[PDB]
Amino acid sequence: AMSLENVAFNVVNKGHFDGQQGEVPVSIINNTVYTKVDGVDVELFENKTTLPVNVAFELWAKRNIKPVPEVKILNNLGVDIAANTVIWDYKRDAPAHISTIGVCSMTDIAKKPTETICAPLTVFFDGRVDGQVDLFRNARNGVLITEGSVKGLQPSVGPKQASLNGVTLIGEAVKTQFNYYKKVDGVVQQLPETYFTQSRNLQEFKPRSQMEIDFLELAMDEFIERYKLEGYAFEHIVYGDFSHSQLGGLHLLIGLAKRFKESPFELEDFIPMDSTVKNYFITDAQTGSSKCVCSVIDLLLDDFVEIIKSQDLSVVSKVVKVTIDYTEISFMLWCKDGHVETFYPKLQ
Amino acid sequence: AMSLENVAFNVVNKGHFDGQQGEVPVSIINNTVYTKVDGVDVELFENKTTLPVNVAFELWAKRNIKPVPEVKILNNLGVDIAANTVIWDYKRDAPAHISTIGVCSMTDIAKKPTETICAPLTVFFDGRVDGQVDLFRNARNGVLITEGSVKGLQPSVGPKQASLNGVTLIGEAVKTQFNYYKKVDGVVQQLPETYFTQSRNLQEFKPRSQMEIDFLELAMDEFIERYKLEGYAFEHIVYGDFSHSQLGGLHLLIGLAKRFKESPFELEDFIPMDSTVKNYFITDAQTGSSKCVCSVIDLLLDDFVEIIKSQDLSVVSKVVKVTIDYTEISFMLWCKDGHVETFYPKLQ
Amino acid sequence: AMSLENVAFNVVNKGHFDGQQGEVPVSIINNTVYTKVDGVDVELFENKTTLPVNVAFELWAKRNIKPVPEVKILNNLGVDIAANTVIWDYKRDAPAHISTIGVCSMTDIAKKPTETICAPLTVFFDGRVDGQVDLFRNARNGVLITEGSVKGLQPSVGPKQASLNGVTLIGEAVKTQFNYYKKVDGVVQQLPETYFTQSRNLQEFKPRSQMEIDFLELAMDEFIERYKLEGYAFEHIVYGDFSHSQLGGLHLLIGLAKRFKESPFELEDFIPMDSTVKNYFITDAQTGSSKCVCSVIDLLLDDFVEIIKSQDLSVVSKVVKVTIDYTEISFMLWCKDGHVETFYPKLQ
Amino acid sequence: AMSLENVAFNVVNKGHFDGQQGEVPVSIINNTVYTKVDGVDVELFENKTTLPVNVAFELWAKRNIKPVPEVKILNNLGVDIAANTVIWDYKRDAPAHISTIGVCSMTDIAKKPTETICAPLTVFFDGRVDGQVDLFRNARNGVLITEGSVKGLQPSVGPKQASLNGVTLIGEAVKTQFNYYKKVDGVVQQLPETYFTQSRNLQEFKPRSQMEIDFLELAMDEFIERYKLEGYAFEHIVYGDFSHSQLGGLHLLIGLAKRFKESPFELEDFIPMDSTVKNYFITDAQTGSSKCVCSVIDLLLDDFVEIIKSQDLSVVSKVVKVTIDYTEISFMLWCKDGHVETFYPKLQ
Amino acid sequence: AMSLENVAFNVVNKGHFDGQQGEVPVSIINNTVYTKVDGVDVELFENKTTLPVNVAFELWAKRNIKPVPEVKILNNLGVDIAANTVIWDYKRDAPAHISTIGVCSMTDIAKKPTETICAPLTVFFDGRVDGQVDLFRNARNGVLITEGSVKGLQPSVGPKQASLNGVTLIGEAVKTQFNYYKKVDGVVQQLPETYFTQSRNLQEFKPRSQMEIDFLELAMDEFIERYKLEGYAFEHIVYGDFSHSQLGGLHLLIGLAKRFKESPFELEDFIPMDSTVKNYFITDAQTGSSKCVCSVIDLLLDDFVEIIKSQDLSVVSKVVKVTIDYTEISFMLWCKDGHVETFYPKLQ
C-alpha cells in the first residue's frame, strides 16, 4: 500500500523507506517535497533527476543502504537494472538505473526478476539478500555480488572499496570487497583480469603503498631515481608540466593530490558521473596553465608503473588497452627514441 | 488513511473523492497530476490554484457535489470556511476558502468546527448533512443553509438557484432554494430583505418575465412606452449608448444580451471571480465604443424597474443603497429636472 | 543530423518535420518552444506531455500526417510502439506511445523494428510504407494496417473512419478503412468479429441510419413503438431519466445528442483519453440530475438495438460481453419479468 | 514611482494602468500575478510572453487602449519600437516590440524617443498624442499615424480598420483610418500604392461587396459565368479542390468561409502571429484532403480579381509582385495555353 | 550550422564549444540541460541566467577560455559587448554582456563589430585575436587589450591579474597583464592614472609587499608604530572595531583576512557581482558586532597608506575621489583635530 504520504512518514521517522505504516502531510512545490513540522514547511527532498518529483522521492527513499558496488563498476559490467533495490547514484543525485523491479509502481517493469521482461536485461543480484544467488543461477543475464563462495561458480575478486550511502570506503565494520559473477545468455562468464581504480578524493587523498608514500614525500627527481623511472615521462604524465599555457600531462590522481598540497586549481567536472576515467577542464591557480580535457584516472601508483613499464616503447603513437574496473580503457602511448613522451587515457 | 495515490484512485474510479480504498500510480510534473493508462501518462488535474499541486488535487477531488450556494452569496454573507466540505469555485478553478475543517491534513485548521480555532470564523454549515444544524447552534460565527424549517430559527428564503458542479441552475430533480441563517458573535442575525441576481450568461441569456420578453423582442421606444419608463434614462442605463468613444451606460445584463444578438463585443473580466456586481473592460465591435470599467449587474428587469422607480429624482447626485444577494450595493443616481440622467452600481 | 533548430526550421517552413535541411534560432522557456520573427518571440509549441519540452517538440513535429487508426483501436489491439513514425494522440496532446523506433534519439529504443528489443513489443506497422508488411512478417509481435490484400494473410476489415491530423473522418479523397492484422508470439492471430464505435461528437452529431434519424426526429413513445422496442428500457438506457437526483441511464451518445438539442449539460471527462467506452461525470443543466460515473458508448443505434435484442432476458443480473473496437466490452444486464430494467457498459 | 503593487492597484480599480496612486497586495506564482480578494487569490494576469512575469504584467497593463494599427501593418512598415506606449499583440498575448521608450524601467532603452539610442530604430509615433508629430519630424527613423493633415507631409491613406483592445474594427464611434508617414535615415519616404487585407475571421466572415455576396450565395459555375472569370482557375485558387489527398488551391479567405458553411476543417496556425499572408496546415473534415502549407490571404474578392486579371498569362511560371499592407507580396503565377493553372502567395 | 545538440557534443567531448562537428541527444527540463550517458541523464548545465536555458547554455559553452580582464575592469571602462567572444561572468554565473557579435544567433546584434549597430557601443577587442587591433583602430567606440605595443597608440598598463576560467591569477605560464586602450567617438583616450584592486580571497589571502607581510605578522600597535600610521585611524578603518553592536570600520580586505585567521564571520554578499568596492552585511561570530553595509575594497596596503597619507585632514567631512580600476571611487573622509576618525568607500 505504497503512497507519497507513507514514503514521507518513513523518511521523517526512519531516515529512509523502512516499510513502516503511517502517513505525514506533504506538499509538492515545483521539484521539492515538503512536510509540515511545528506548523511550517520543512524540505524533505529536492529532485535533481529527470523523473517526476514524487517518483524520484520514492526511489531515493528506497535507495540501498548497504555497501554496494560503485556505479562505475556496475556500468562497466553492463548492469541495466537491480533486483528489488535502488542503486542510488550519489554523483548524479539520481537512480543509477532507469527502471526498477519490485520497488515502485511508476518505475517497475516487473515485481520479480524472473518475469520475461527481465531475461534480456543484465539484472544486478546481491548474494547478501536471501534467494538472490539462486535467482542469478536461474537468470539469463545478470551480475552477482557475494561476500563468500557460491558452489561451482568461479569468482572474480572485486575492488576493496564499495559505496555506503554515497561514501566510498574500504569496510572495517562491514564487508565492501565482493566476489563478482556474470552471466551472458545463460552462460557464466570468465570475468577478465583487471586493475581497479582506487576511488580517492583530492582533498582527503591517502597513499596505499610505500611507492605512493614516497611519491608524496620525496621530491620529483629523487622519487624517479629511487624507482628507476627515468625515460617514462613521469615529469609530464604524473607530476604535470605547468610551464606552458596548455597544462602538460597530469593524468594520475596522486599527481593532482601532490600539486594540491602546494597550490590549488579548478577542476571543472563537465560530465558529472562516476566513471573509471574522469575528464576535467583544469585551470592551475598558481601558473595559469590550463587544459580543456584533462583525463584523470586514480590508479595505485604501483599499478600505473606496472602498466607503463609493460609497454613496447619503439613506436611513435599507438593505442594501449588496459582492463580497469572490468572495462577496456584505451590509452594513447607516445614515444620517441625508446622513451615515453606521454601516456594518457584516450579522449575519444 | 489519506494519500495522493488514494485520492487519484477515487478520481479515476469514482469521478471524485468517494472514500473508497485503493491506490493508482501517479506522477506529478510541475503543476499537473498524471496517472498511467495503457503505458502512457493521462492528465487527472491541472492546478490553477496558489496551493501546492497535490494539496489542490485533494481539495478539488473532495469538492462538494451537491447543489451549493453560489460563491458570491457565501462571500456576501461573510463565509470564511466550510464545515467538513470544500466549496469549489468553478470561476476561479480554486477552493472558495483558504482553509478547511476535516477535509485535508495540509489545509485543515481543525477536524471539527467545534474546535476553538473556528469560533471567530464564519463557518458554512449544511443542514442536509447530519449534525450540522446542531453545530451551527453551537458555533459562535456561521452561516447555515437548510431545505426546511429549523425549530425557533427565523429563516431567510435564499435565491432560487444554486451551483451544482459549477452549473448554476434552478433545481427540478434536486432542491436549490435554501433557507439561510447567520450568526455573528454567538447571536443569530436577522438577514435583510434582499433582491437576488439572476446569474445568467450572455451567450445563453433567457428572459424570466413578460417584461424581459418585451425588452428583448420590442424596439427601444415601444418598450419604454409600454412600461411607462420615460424619464428613467433606460436608453443610456439599460440599452447603452454606443455613439461616443466612451460607451454610455449598459449596466444591466439583459441590455448586454439584447446588444449581443445584433453585434458582438469583448468583455474583459479583469478581476475574475463571482460577484453580485461585475466590472468589465468592454469594447463594442460594431462601433468601437469602449469603457475600461463597466459595472454590470444581472437583476430581473422588473426588479431593476422597481428599484429605479422607487427613488426620489429631485437631487443632482446621491448614493442609492440596495440590498442585493444579502450585500448592500451602492448605486450612483444622477438626476436633472426631475428625470434620471444615469443610475449605475457605484465604482470603487 | 537531427537538431532542435532543424526541427524548428522544418516546423516554420513545412508545417511539420519534412526532412529538410536548415536551422532557425529557437528559445526554450519553461515548457514552450519559441522562434524569433520580426524581432519578437513566436510560440511554435507548448509541451503538454511528460517528456522534456525539446523531446516532445521533436515527436510532435514528426507525427504521422496520413490517416492513421484512432488511438482507442491501437490501444485495444495492444499496440506498444510504432515502427518509424509517431502516432500523436490529439486528445492527450501527447505521443500515443512511450518510446519510438527510428524517430528521435532521446526516445528511440531501436532504429529498426528488427532489433531484438522490439521482439516482445507489439509494433505498429503501416503497409502504406515500403517494407513494413515484410517487417510485420518478421516481427514476433505486431499490428499491421494495409489498404489492400497481403498474400496469405487473412484480413480483418477495420472501422470506416481514421484520424487525419486529429480529425476523425471517413475518407473521400484518402483511404481511411484499413485491413488489420495482428501477431502474438510469432503467430498471426485471428481478429474477432467486432462492432465499431462511430467516434461522433455531441456538438456535431449526425445520424448514420434511418433508425438514428427517427430517434432524433420522433418523440420517445413513437420511436419505441415504430421499432418495437417495448420492454427494452430505452426510456432509461438511451433517452435518460432526469427525474431523480441521480441521472438514470443515458449510455448511448445518440441519446446525449438528442438531450443536448433541448437543453445543455456538463460532461466532466475525468480520464481524458480516447477509449471505446468513455466515463463522464454528468450534470444536467435543466433539472440538476447528475451522475459521477456515466459510461457512454457511441454505437450506431441499429448496432445497439441488435445487441440488446440478442440477449436472454430471463435472469435478474448478468454480464453480457460484446466485442467492440476489437476489445471485449462487459455490459451489465438487469432484467425483471422478461423485460430489461437497465443495460450499461459495466463500471470497474 | 512605478511598482508592481501600483500596477496591480490600477488593473483592479481602472481595468488597466491609468496613472492612479495606490497599492494592492500581490503574489507572484510561477508566471501568474494574483491579488487577494475575499481572503483568496484571484488571477490578474497569466504571462504568455518570454519577459519576466512582473515585467510582462506592467507592459500589458500599459497597453495602448485607443484604436491602433494592426501589428501586421506595423511589422510591414518596419516598426521596431513605439514612442511612450505599448502596442500589445493580442494574437501572441505579448508586446508587439521587444523594448520600450518611457514605459517601464525593465524594458526601456530610453525615456524619450529623442535619445540617440532611438535614432537607428524605426519608432512608432501617434499624432493623436501631443508632441508626437514633432518627435517624428525630429526622428531619424519612424512611422507616424495621424487622423488629419500634417503640414507639408504627403500622406498615405491606411486601412479602414484598426485594432481596439484586440478587436479589429472599422470605427464608427472612434476613428480607425489613419494617415501614414514613414522616415528612413532622416528622409521621409514615399509609401507605395497598396491593397489592404480585410482582417476577417472564418467564423464571422461578412462579404464587403456585391461580388463577395454573389460568391457566397451563387454556385461556383454561375459566379464564374457572371463575373467572366473563365480561364482564371478560381475553381482551384479560390473554391479549392478537395478531390485528391493534397488539397488544391484555396488561398483566399472568402473561399475558406464558403467551404466552412458547408463542412468544417482544421486550420493549424503553425506560426501564430499576425501577417498579411498566413500559412496553415489544413485538413478538410469532409474529404480528408489536406495540405501542410496552405498560404491564405484575406483580400476583398474584387481586389483579388483585379490583381489576377491584370497579369500576362503567356508564360509557364513567373513571380507576380503585389503591394499589400505596404509590403511586397510575391505570388507564383502558373499558366498554360493562355489560361491560369494556379496563382498563390509564393511559399518561402 | 549551430544547434543545441552540436553545442552539447562540443561540451561533452571538448569541455567547451570548440567548433567540432557532431551531435549528442539532449533533454531540457526546466532550466537544466541533460545528455544521455549509459542510458541515464547526466546534467551538462544548469541555467542561473535570465536568458532562455538553451541560449545560456550556448553562451556558456562559447565562453572565452583565455585569461581575460576581470568583469569589474570591463564594466569600469564602459564595455557594452565583446567582439566575437563571450566574457562569462563567473560571479553572476551569467554572460557579462546582454548581447553578442558573431557568437550565437539568438543574442547576436551583428556578425562583425564593423556593422553600424556596433558603432555607438563600446566593443571589447582582444589584440591576441588576429585582426582585432585593426578592428579597434577602425571602431568608433571600443576598449582594446594587447600583450605588447600597438604602433602609435600610447598604452595604459592594466592590472597584473586576469580571470582565466573564473580563476583570478597573475599568470606565470600565460600573460595576464594587458595594455589597455580606449576610443570614445573615434578619439583615442588618455586613460587616467589609476590604482588597481588586488582581487584576493579571504580564505587564501596572500600579502604582496613587505608592509602587507608586517600587517599580518605584527600586532596592531607595533605595525602602526613601524609604519608611522598614528592618527590615521587604522585601528578603526583597517583592523576593525568589534567592541560595539555596530562593527567599526573594517574596509580593507587585508584587515578582514587578519581577523579571519583569529575568528570567523558571516559576509552576506547582497549584490553578488564583481565590483571595485564590495558591500557586505557582516556579522562577527566571536563578538556579535555587525554592520548591514560594510564597504570593502582590496587595495595593496601600501596603496591605501599612500591614499590616506595624501589627504588634507583639516575638515570634519568630505568626499575624497580616487581612481581605482579606471573608475572614480568616492570615499568619505571624517577628521577631527587634524586626525582621521574614519575613511571608507562611500555608500551612495
Ligand SMILES: Cc1cn([C@H]2C[C@H](O)[C@@H](CS)O2)c(=O)[nH]c1=O
Ligand atoms: C535530501 C536530498 C537528497 N538528495 C540526494 C542527494 C544525494 O545523492 C543523496 C543524499 S542521501 O540524495 C537529493 O537529491 N535531494 C535532497 O533533498
Ligand SMILES: Cc1cn([C@H]2C[C@H](O)[C@@H](CS)O2)c(=O)[nH]c1=O
Ligand atoms: C480536470 C480539472 C478541473 N479543474 C477544476 C476546473 C473546474 O473549476 C473544475 C471542473 S471539475 O475543477 C482544474 O482546475 N484542473 C483540472 O484539471
Ligand SMILES: Cc1cn([C@H]2C[C@H](O)[C@@H](CS)O2)c(=O)[nH]c1=O
Ligand atoms: C501547436 C501545438 C500543438 N500541440 C499538440 C496539440 C494537438 O494535439 C496537436 C495539434 S497539431 O499538437 C501542442 O501540444 N502544443 C502546441 O503548441
Ligand SMILES: Cc1cn([C@H]2C[C@H](O)[C@@H](CS)O2)c(=O)[nH]c1=O
Ligand atoms: C487577463 C490576461 C490577458 N492577457 C493578454 C491576453 C490578450 O492578448 C490580452 C487580453 S486584455 O492580454 C494575458 O496574457 N494574460 C492574462 O491573464
Ligand SMILES: Cc1cn([C@H]2C[C@H](O)[C@@H](CS)O2)c(=O)[nH]c1=O
Ligand atoms: C556546469 C555549469 C556551469 N555553470 C556556470 C557556473 C560558472 O560560472 C561556470 C563554471 S564553468 O558556468 C552554470 O551556471 N551551470 C552549470 O551547470
